[PDB]
Design an enzyme around this catalytic site. Sequence first.
Site, PDB file in Angstrom:
ATOM      1  N   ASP A   1      30.386  55.001  22.922  1.00 46.61           N
ATOM      2  CA  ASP A   1      29.669  56.036  22.159  1.00 46.61           C
ATOM      3  C   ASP A   1      28.168  56.129  22.530  1.00 46.61           C
ATOM      4  O   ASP A   1      27.598  57.223  22.556  1.00 46.61           O
ATOM      5  CB  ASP A   1      29.889  55.899  20.639  1.00 46.61           C
TER       6      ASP A   1
ATOM      7  N   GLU B   1      34.720  46.893  32.732  1.00 47.70           N
ATOM      8  CA  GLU B   1      33.349  46.875  33.232  1.00 47.70           C
ATOM      9  C   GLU B   1      33.110  45.823  34.309  1.00 47.70           C
ATOM     10  O   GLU B   1      32.304  46.064  35.230  1.00 47.70           O
ATOM     11  CB  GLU B   1      32.343  46.662  32.099  1.00 47.70           C
TER      12      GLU B   1
ATOM     13  N   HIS C   1      27.385  48.214  15.690  1.00 43.31           N
ATOM     14  CA  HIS C   1      28.375  47.654  16.598  1.00 43.31           C
ATOM     15  C   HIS C   1      27.780  47.350  17.976  1.00 43.31           C
ATOM     16  O   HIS C   1      26.887  48.068  18.446  1.00 43.31           O
ATOM     17  CB  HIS C   1      29.596  48.581  16.713  1.00 43.31           C
ATOM     18  N   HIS C   2      28.310  46.298  18.616  1.00 44.73           N
ATOM     19  CA  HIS C   2      27.843  45.781  19.917  1.00 44.73           C
ATOM     20  C   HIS C   2      26.484  45.064  19.782  1.00 44.73           C
ATOM     21  O   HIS C   2      25.740  44.972  20.745  1.00 44.73           O
ATOM     22  CB  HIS C   2      27.744  46.863  21.018  1.00 44.73           C
TER      23      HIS C   2
ATOM     24  N   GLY D   1      31.265  34.227  45.651  1.00 44.52           N
ATOM     25  CA  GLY D   1      32.638  33.731  45.694  1.00 44.52           C
ATOM     26  C   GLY D   1      33.434  33.924  44.410  1.00 44.52           C
ATOM     27  O   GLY D   1      34.124  33.022  43.966  1.00 44.52           O
TER      28      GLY D   1
ATOM     29  N   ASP E   1      47.430  36.232  45.568  1.00 42.14           N
ATOM     30  CA  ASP E   1      48.109  36.483  44.297  1.00 42.14           C
ATOM     31  C   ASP E   1      47.246  36.068  43.093  1.00 42.14           C
ATOM     32  O   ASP E   1      47.114  36.824  42.118  1.00 42.14           O
ATOM     33  CB  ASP E   1      49.514  35.825  44.226  1.00 42.14           C
TER      34      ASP E   1
ATOM     35  N   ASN F   1      51.686  33.324  47.717  1.00 41.94           N
ATOM     36  CA  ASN F   1      52.020  31.942  48.080  1.00 41.94           C
ATOM     37  C   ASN F   1      52.172  31.112  46.808  1.00 41.94           C
ATOM     38  O   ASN F   1      51.959  29.895  46.820  1.00 41.94           O
ATOM     39  CB  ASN F   1      50.988  31.324  49.044  1.00 41.94           C
TER      40      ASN F   1
ATOM     41  N   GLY G   1      50.651  30.822  43.815  1.00 42.55           N
ATOM     42  CA  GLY G   1      49.520  30.140  43.164  1.00 42.55           C
ATOM     43  C   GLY G   1      48.251  30.016  43.989  1.00 42.55           C
ATOM     44  O   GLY G   1      48.044  30.758  44.953  1.00 42.55           O
TER      45      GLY G   1
ATOM     46  N   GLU H   1      42.889  25.952  46.237  1.00 40.50           N
ATOM     47  CA  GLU H   1      42.608  24.864  45.278  1.00 40.50           C
ATOM     48  C   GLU H   1      43.500  23.660  45.544  1.00 40.50           C
ATOM     49  O   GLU H   1      43.038  22.517  45.479  1.00 40.50           O
ATOM     50  CB  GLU H   1      42.804  25.318  43.834  1.00 40.50           C
TER      51      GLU H   1
HETATM   52  C1  TPP Z   1      34.194  46.454  26.497  1.00 40.09           C
HETATM   53  C2  TPP Z   1      34.076  47.783  25.805  1.00 40.09           C
HETATM   54  N1  TPP Z   1      33.919  48.915  26.561  1.00 40.09           N
HETATM   55  C3  TPP Z   1      33.812  50.171  25.963  1.00 40.09           C
HETATM   56  C4  TPP Z   1      33.846  50.275  24.579  1.00 40.09           C
HETATM   57  C5  TPP Z   1      33.740  51.638  23.932  1.00 40.09           C
HETATM   58  N2  TPP Z   1      34.979  52.038  23.273  1.00 40.09           N
HETATM   59  C6  TPP Z   1      35.279  51.904  21.929  1.00 40.09           C
HETATM   60  S1  TPP Z   1      36.731  52.444  21.464  1.00 40.09           S
HETATM   61  C7  TPP Z   1      37.034  52.923  22.983  1.00 40.09           C
HETATM   62  C8  TPP Z   1      38.355  53.614  23.255  1.00 40.09           C
HETATM   63  C9  TPP Z   1      39.587  52.779  22.939  1.00 40.09           C
HETATM   64  O1  TPP Z   1      40.695  53.576  23.281  1.00 40.09           O
HETATM   65  P1  TPP Z   1      42.189  53.130  22.946  1.00 40.09           P
HETATM   66  O2  TPP Z   1      42.372  51.639  23.126  1.00 40.09           O
HETATM   67  O3  TPP Z   1      43.119  53.933  23.836  1.00 40.09           O
HETATM   68  O4  TPP Z   1      42.304  53.443  21.364  1.00 40.09           O
HETATM   69  P2  TPP Z   1      42.759  54.830  20.651  1.00 40.09           P
HETATM   70  O5  TPP Z   1      41.594  55.258  19.804  1.00 40.09           O
HETATM   71  O6  TPP Z   1      43.145  55.855  21.680  1.00 40.09           O
HETATM   72  O7  TPP Z   1      43.921  54.460  19.773  1.00 40.09           O
HETATM   73  C10 TPP Z   1      36.012  52.662  23.897  1.00 40.09           C
HETATM   74  C11 TPP Z   1      36.045  53.011  25.360  1.00 40.09           C
HETATM   75  C12 TPP Z   1      33.980  49.111  23.815  1.00 40.09           C
HETATM   76  N3  TPP Z   1      33.999  49.158  22.503  1.00 40.09           N
HETATM   77  N4  TPP Z   1      34.107  47.887  24.436  1.00 40.09           N
HETATM   78  C1  TPP Z   2      35.898  34.129  38.881  1.00 44.03           C
HETATM   79  C2  TPP Z   2      36.337  32.900  39.611  1.00 44.03           C
HETATM   80  N1  TPP Z   2      37.125  31.970  38.968  1.00 44.03           N
HETATM   81  C3  TPP Z   2      37.570  30.834  39.621  1.00 44.03           C
HETATM   82  C4  TPP Z   2      37.196  30.592  40.939  1.00 44.03           C
HETATM   83  C5  TPP Z   2      37.683  29.341  41.677  1.00 44.03           C
HETATM   84  N2  TPP Z   2      38.631  29.644  42.755  1.00 44.03           N
HETATM   85  C6  TPP Z   2      38.320  29.795  44.103  1.00 44.03           C
HETATM   86  S1  TPP Z   2      39.557  30.132  45.093  1.00 44.03           S
HETATM   87  C7  TPP Z   2      40.560  30.084  43.828  1.00 44.03           C
HETATM   88  C8  TPP Z   2      42.017  30.318  44.119  1.00 44.03           C
HETATM   89  C9  TPP Z   2      42.336  31.707  44.665  1.00 44.03           C
HETATM   90  O1  TPP Z   2      43.750  31.739  44.770  1.00 44.03           O
HETATM   91  P1  TPP Z   2      44.530  32.858  45.628  1.00 44.03           P
HETATM   92  O2  TPP Z   2      43.855  34.185  45.315  1.00 44.03           O
HETATM   93  O3  TPP Z   2      45.976  32.818  45.195  1.00 44.03           O
HETATM   94  O4  TPP Z   2      44.242  32.482  47.153  1.00 44.03           O
HETATM   95  P2  TPP Z   2      45.142  31.565  48.149  1.00 44.03           P
HETATM   96  O5  TPP Z   2      46.356  31.105  47.388  1.00 44.03           O
HETATM   97  O6  TPP Z   2      45.540  32.444  49.294  1.00 44.03           O
HETATM   98  O7  TPP Z   2      44.241  30.447  48.580  1.00 44.03           O
HETATM   99  C10 TPP Z   2      39.969  29.801  42.594  1.00 44.03           C
HETATM  100  C11 TPP Z   2      40.688  29.695  41.274  1.00 44.03           C
HETATM  101  C12 TPP Z   2      36.375  31.533  41.576  1.00 44.03           C
HETATM  102  N3  TPP Z   2      35.937  31.372  42.818  1.00 44.03           N
HETATM  103  N4  TPP Z   2      35.965  32.671  40.903  1.00 44.03           N
HETATM  104 MG    MG Z   3      47.635  32.303  46.212  1.00 43.68          MG
END
Ligand code: TPP
Ligand code: TPP
Ligand code: MG
Lengths: 546, 546
Positions: B31, B54, B117-118, B401, B428, B455, B457, B461
């Site tokens: 909003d 976001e 709010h927020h 990273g 994955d 693979n 998991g 790691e």
């Molecule tokens: C992280 C975050 N991003 C954006 C908003 C703004 N926001 C509040 S309600 C809303 C829409 C929610 O839509 P939906 O889950 O489809 O509910 P509906 O009213 O359609 O039932 C948004 C984007 C928020 N509150 N939090």
């Molecule tokens: C936001 C975030 N959380 C956790 C990590 C730690 N981390 C680095 S690599 C990795 C595993 C990625 O796994 P995958 O995407 O399946 O790659 P692969 O199996 O091919 O090595 C994790 C958990 C990170 N780098 N960033």
């Molecule tokens: Mg993997």
Amino acid sequence: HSSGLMYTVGDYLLDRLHELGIEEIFGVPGDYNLQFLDQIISREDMKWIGNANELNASYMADGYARTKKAAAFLTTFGVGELSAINGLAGSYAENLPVVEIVGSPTSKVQNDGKFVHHTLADGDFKHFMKMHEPVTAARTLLTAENATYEIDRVLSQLLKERKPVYINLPVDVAAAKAEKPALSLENTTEQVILSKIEESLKNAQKPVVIAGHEVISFGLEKTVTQFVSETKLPITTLNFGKSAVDESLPSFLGIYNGKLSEISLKNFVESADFILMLGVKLTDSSTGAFTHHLDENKMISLNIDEGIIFNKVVEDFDFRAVVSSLSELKGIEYEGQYIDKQYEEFIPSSAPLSQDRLWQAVESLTQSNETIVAEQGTSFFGASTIFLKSNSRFIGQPLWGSIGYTFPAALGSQIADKESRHLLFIGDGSLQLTVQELGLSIREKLNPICFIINNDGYTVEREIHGPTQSYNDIPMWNYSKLPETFGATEDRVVSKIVRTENEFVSVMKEAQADVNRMYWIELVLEKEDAPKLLKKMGKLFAEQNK
Amino acid sequence: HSSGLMYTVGDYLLDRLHELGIEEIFGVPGDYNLQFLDQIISREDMKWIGNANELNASYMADGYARTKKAAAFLTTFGVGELSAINGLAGSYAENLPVVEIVGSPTSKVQNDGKFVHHTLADGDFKHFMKMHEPVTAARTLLTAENATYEIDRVLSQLLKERKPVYINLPVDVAAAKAEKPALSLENTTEQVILSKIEESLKNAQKPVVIAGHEVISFGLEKTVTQFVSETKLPITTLNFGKSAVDESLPSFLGIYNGKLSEISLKNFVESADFILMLGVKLTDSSTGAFTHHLDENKMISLNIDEGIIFNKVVEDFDFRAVVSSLSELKGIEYEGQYIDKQYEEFIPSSAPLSQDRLWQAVESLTQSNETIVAEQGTSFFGASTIFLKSNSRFIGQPLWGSIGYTFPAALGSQIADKESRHLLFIGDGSLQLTVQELGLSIREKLNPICFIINNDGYTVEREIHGPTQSYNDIPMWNYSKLPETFGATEDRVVSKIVRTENEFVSVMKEAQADVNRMYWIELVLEKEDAPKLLKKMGKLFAEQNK
Ligand SMILES: Cc1ncc(C[n+]2csc(CCOP(=O)(O)OP(=O)(O)O)c2C)c(N)n1
Ligand SMILES: Cc1ncc(C[n+]2csc(CCOP(=O)(O)OP(=O)(O)O)c2C)c(N)n1
Ligand SMILES: [Mg+2]
Ligand SMILES: [Mg+2]
């Protein structure tokens, strides 16, 4: 052993978390926390429940805290913690006792100022903790020498305020030697406050109690429910803190939401000759956009941070202490009337589902010992006015209001109390932010009943501004097919699409009966359809932004 | 005649974003930003591209910046901005010019300290901007009286450092009157540096250039490529800044990664008699865990913030200016040899796909005019050492990273340059963090080629620590079915599961040949299988955590 047949900083921390009642830890692994993770895995009394992402982990920990009354999640330095910070901010805003543990590089790497992964390549390992200052009650960077005192300091602060705290745990520090804790972590003005409450209650011809979210923060719901039960005092809550008391109580009036309140409730609350507020905060979404009329001159309010005794501000008291001393008060008995309760019935037709009828149906068909979780959007505004049955609870986030929160949060709360059947109402737009925890729900064999409101976008936003603007549209997923795609079989998750009132009642009863499977129910509703409360509140939000 | 007888602050901001070359704005509505959103939607020169969440928006804007050389995204106060802060942090760490716009409550609401709010219900609307201080080059809370001044200040800082900046835009301020911008957004130290570089290259028998990520930050890849092409100077990059030069250059040696470099490359770089570093930062993942050997006594290094000329620190210079003058230098042509190019024709078989063979195949099949995007994990380790074809680029994030980054980032980069075919390699585990932007990819009809390495998991790691620990397992989704479930039709997305080398060659060629659809390719590899480079770094990280 029940049968009668080196200790480290990691063990110390996990022992203290156990003392707080935490039986599950959420989060995401990273190289800076794997050694500590091994310690979590090795615990007999604690389970690692890994999330798809950190934001979701933080939301999940918050939901768990709402029900378990303490929680913990684990992230990795920089990338993990910063992904989770919005969740922790919500826990701060709505006052939930969540511990975030952040695994960090070894003490030596930090002291050397090395340009390692998950840093800004400036040698500074303290930026991210600083960034948490506004959203944590306490924070610490542990060392081998400081660890036991610092852990105790921050967790003692968690106990005192029930706000989130933050523990940065270097790899080498978790493995460092420690000694088991020797002791567990666990009044004049307080007596004056109680005496004035007693006097006021006994002299009042029309008292009203208003309970809020801080009651939930401290796990004081049963205490307040018992107090109100014994004294017969009229009681209301805002939608911020809904289920701070048991809503089945004969003296529970309903939800006070300023000028948007039901008329008899509004009149009762605003004509009361004494008001006792317990843990309440008056926010835009919980006061019909600040259209409440609550006279400070007739009020004693108690909050964690302060009390106001007929306009006299006080700070030198413990909120928990005062609230738990209410049932020391004897001889309080309300002898007046409440307000007429409307008869609750829902008879379905073949009509397509509408918002107002949906919430009437949920109110009728919701049972005792359930937890209703409702996302910002039509779900929160619809579900917020339903009268809950005995021993039932509600989770909503009207102050912080972070869409997507409710899905992981519902799962966390469901894990926290597996005896309380969780019913989730989440919008299509909100589900899209946090959908990946579907994997966790399947792996953990959780059995909540999940309702996805497919109304082809952001209906609450359309109600505030730009009803036909393209930014209120979202890509339409095949919501009912998510569990299958995320690996669920029919013996784990039952998926449905519901369009009519008859279909809703059939599936709801089916779901409620079958306690051993998760239900994933796509509800189809029109984008233009909003519950009566939101039709009014949408315009008030719009006005607030002019 | 025979007789003889409202431009606004929002418009100003959007005009400046247009000036930076931005044609798309990412983000999520709330909003507090919807009225500004109307202004974006009404623009003819740019498009709103709404994300599911976001964090993903911030990642997408980062990827867009890497290719477009400027980017912007829009969030709502508190919940939106804090959700995105990890992305913005990554843009700070790796120096990408991203502008985050945060829609905030009206100045009246902020001034009155309203519990809206927020917020944390403390009446303080400044916490969240303060929390951005360590991860922004500049930030502003706009007022009607300072808006144009502050917008220009912060966007000028974005132009100077190419680091992220932050604009908090209250509802009423965006709608406030403004005047169109009057001015466009825009030494001896530099001459001495250029003269010393010229002299050093004239005197060197075996010079080497090392180009890094700050070249990419400033859009100087073509400039460096031209300079190297004309002079024939040997050049290498780290994996941090891969594609800072065109890898098809005759004098491009490969990737320098400390002791994990190919032997002849390592020997060449480490025996060079002069080293010119351009926009390089030496980090753990980009130096084989700090096993580089680069003699500062033989080095001139130039960075955005600092220059070192044979150990003598300099500040007072424009990095972009110096790099852009390198082609003005005379008599610096290299007349020596490089290193031998090994060649093996890749011949596929029916053998199940293995990691080293996979990257061999990708190298053999990659084409000109592609952008390869590789996620931390086996993908980055494997893909980072592939030789790119002419006019091809690379996106990886080895310093920050943050797993999950690459999926929204690939889409953002793909939007930024519709004529460069993006090939994404994501694990994955990592896909599960950011999968929801699949809806955006369908709506926007983007045609990237996406490879999901299933693979079972977190294999990277498992290689660092705990190969059979349950925390390295993830719930297995049916990855190939995701597009259909997110609403894709077969005219939009082609989905496949690939198990063998023959299948891989077939599908990759098929994908490259079909420019009019998106490809979603699940690769099946064993959890224990790691590329040879990772079989080394796995241990080096482990050591680093001792
Ligand atoms: C992280 C975050 N991003 C954006 C908003 C703004 N926001 C509040 S309600 C809303 C829409 C929610 O839509 P939906 O889950 O489809 O509910 P509906 O009213 O359609 O039932 C948004 C984007 C928020 N509150 N939090
Ligand atoms: C936001 C975030 N959380 C956790 C990590 C730690 N981390 C680095 S690599 C990795 C595993 C990625 O796994 P995958 O995407 O399946 O790659 P692969 O199996 O091919 O090595 C994790 C958990 C990170 N780098 N960033
Ligand atoms: Mg993997
Ligand atoms: Mg919706």
